[PDB]
Amino acid sequence: TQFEERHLKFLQQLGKGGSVEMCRYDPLQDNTGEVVAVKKLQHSTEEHLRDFEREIEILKSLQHDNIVKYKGVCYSAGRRNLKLIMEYLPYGSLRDYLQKHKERIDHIKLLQYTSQICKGMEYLGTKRYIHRDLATRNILVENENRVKIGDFGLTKVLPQDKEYYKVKEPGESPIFWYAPESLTESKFSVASDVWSFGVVLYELFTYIEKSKSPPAEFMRMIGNDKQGQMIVFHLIELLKNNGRLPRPDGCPDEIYMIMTECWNNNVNQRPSFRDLALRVDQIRDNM
Ligand SMILES: Oc1ccc(C2=Nc3ccccc3-c3ccnc4[nH]cc2c34)c(Cl)c1
């Protein structure tokens, strides 16, 4: 079924990278229609369109409780400058949601979100998709009891014969969430996604205290005087020599263990998401 543009009423801006807006889909024209989230492109060159169209196919192929739901596409005369339509998740980003509620969400709740993040990523892996941008600002909160993986604008499908995807011309990169081989060779895989997931679990257990974020720690470790491409040079040598983010204040030592195990230089030694979700649920059972 179709989403017609004249019926999408703008409500509020949500994020720019394209750009995401909260709209009401109101075909009855009486303001009782569904509130939806809508993405469209900012500058519509053929390469960005091609990436957007891929993001749309990927999201459309995913149906999991912890993956944001695709609803449809709104099409357009002359240019066919699509809008992506999705479910609106009303508590917003997990980063912003944890900042607001800080330590008033206990370790048990944090582990419920962690579990659901692993479950979502694991499902993503059974399809041979590499997310590439797992961080708390890219996870969305549906309610107290449920989070979903979002932002698929950077996801790649592995080739049929290879276990990594190599980016030739990197654009915007969240280097502080990156695996060493992604920093050095621009190789991305299930294992690099697991490494990032380690950084997400750190984020969670620091409750997003700013002076504690990944960029902050890593910059203190490399020295705050490093600028541009020298940050990458230094971060790579630091990672090689086993500099890591510390264990956050109050973090249970068994959760810290998972982090450090995700942050292994040897890609083959990082655990799998299936095992992570098993482990994380066992820890929940215990508490
Ligand atoms: O491939 C994807 C996956 C998730 C979203 C998405 N992104 C956002 C980006 C910034 C700020 C808020 C959102 C947001 C807020 C509330 N509900 C929402 N549903 C869906 C999104 C969202 C998008 Cl645009 C594309």
Side-chain angles (χ1 to χ4, degrees):
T1 199
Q2 295 298 127
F3 288 88
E4 321 167 47
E5 223 275 285
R6 66 181 293 180
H7 289 147
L8 273 183
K9 282 164 179 190
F10 172 83
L11 301 170
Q12 212 202 279
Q13 193 218 230
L14 291 163
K16 316 279 257 181
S19 81
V20 197
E21 320 181 303
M22 173 188 135
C23 297
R24 190 178 302 276
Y25 192 63
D26 192 37
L28 277 318
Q29 300 200 246
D30 65 355
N31 294 295
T32 62
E34 189 175 14
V35 174
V36 288
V38 174
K39 174 186 187 160
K40 52 209 203 37
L41 273 175
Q42 273 209 108
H43 348 269
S44 23
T45 63
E46 55 192 295
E47 187 205 288
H48 280 92
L49 247 132
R50 217 192 180 147
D51 288 338
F52 187 37
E53 198 103 31
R54 260 185 263 183
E55 178 178 358
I56 299 173
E57 285 314 298
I58 282 148
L59 197 59
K60 167 159 51 199
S61 77
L62 294 167
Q63 26 274 167
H64 193 269
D65 285 354
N66 315 104
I67 294 188
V68 80
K69 303 175 151 104
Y70 168 82
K71 295 171 141 281
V73 172
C74 160
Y75 290 100
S76 143
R79 62 192 322 251
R80 172 225 208 235
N81 195 245
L82 330 158
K83 294 181 184 53
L84 165 64
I85 301 136
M86 295 151 301
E87 68 173 344
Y88 174 66
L89 301 184
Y91 285 73
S93 148
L94 175 57
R95 195 169 170 288
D96 298 335
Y97 177 87
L98 229 202
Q99 268 181 235
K100 270 187 62 87
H101 315 329
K102 304 269 174 193
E103 303 196 350
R104 329 201 209 84
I105 297 168
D106 57 22
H107 286 178
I108 272 153
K109 196 55 118 164
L110 283 186
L111 290 175
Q112 182 182 30
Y113 305 154
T114 307
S115 191
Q116 295 170 358
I117 298 147
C118 296
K119 290 172 182 166
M121 293 301 302
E122 200 258 346
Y123 171 79
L124 209 21
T126 66
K127 307 264 180 177
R128 293 189 50 91
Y129 292 157
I130 314 303
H131 189 286
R132 296 188 60 237
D133 201 7
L134 249 195
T136 63
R137 57 168 190 182
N138 296 325
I139 303 162
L140 298 147
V141 184
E142 189 194 350
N143 63 49
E144 254 148 44
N145 298 306
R146 189 142 107 186
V147 307
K148 308 195 179 173
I149 298 158
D151 193 38
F152 292 87
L154 300 188
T155 297
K156 306 277 161 193
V157 188
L158 296 168
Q160 213 145 57
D161 41 340
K162 280 193 207 313
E163 298 316 300
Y164 63 84
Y165 186 106
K166 182 178 23 58
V167 175
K168 298 290 154 120
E169 268 162 296
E172 41 149 317
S173 304
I175 57 160
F176 298 116
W177 274 257
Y178 273 7
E181 68 281 357
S182 309
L183 294 173
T184 65
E185 311 181 79
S186 223
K187 302 191 341 173
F188 292 93
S189 54
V190 180
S192 69
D193 268 359
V194 166
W195 171 287
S196 294
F197 166 79
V199 177
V200 170
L201 187 52
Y202 180 75
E203 290 189 80
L204 298 176
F205 281 80
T206 57
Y207 285 91
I208 307 121
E209 171 157 24
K210 62 148 206 84
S211 59
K212 286 324 198 293
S213 77
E217 298 286 348
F218 281 129
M219 289 311 293
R220 195 178 62 59
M221 273 180 272
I222 73 170
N224 300 107
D225 50 305
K226 301 314 181 295
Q227 305 178 302
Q229 87 188 124
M230 295 298 299
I231 293 163
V232 182
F233 174 98
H234 288 278
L235 185 60
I236 283 163
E237 297 299 292
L238 178 76
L239 294 175
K240 271 170 58 202
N241 291 112
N242 280 147
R244 286 299 181 271
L245 295 168
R247 175 222 277 215
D249 194 49
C251 182
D253 8 315
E254 57 277 7
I255 291 144
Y256 189 53
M257 293 172 197
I258 302 179
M259 289 179 212
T260 61
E261 155 154 7
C262 295
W263 306 323
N264 203 308
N265 290 150
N266 183 327
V267 317
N268 276 357
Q269 263 174 196
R270 304 179 191 157
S272 75
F273 284 111
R274 178 210 281 152
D275 287 340
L276 284 153
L278 275 165
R279 273 189 225 180
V280 167
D281 288 344
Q282 182 60 67
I283 298 161
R284 290 166 67 208
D285 201 69
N286 283 161
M287 293 154 161

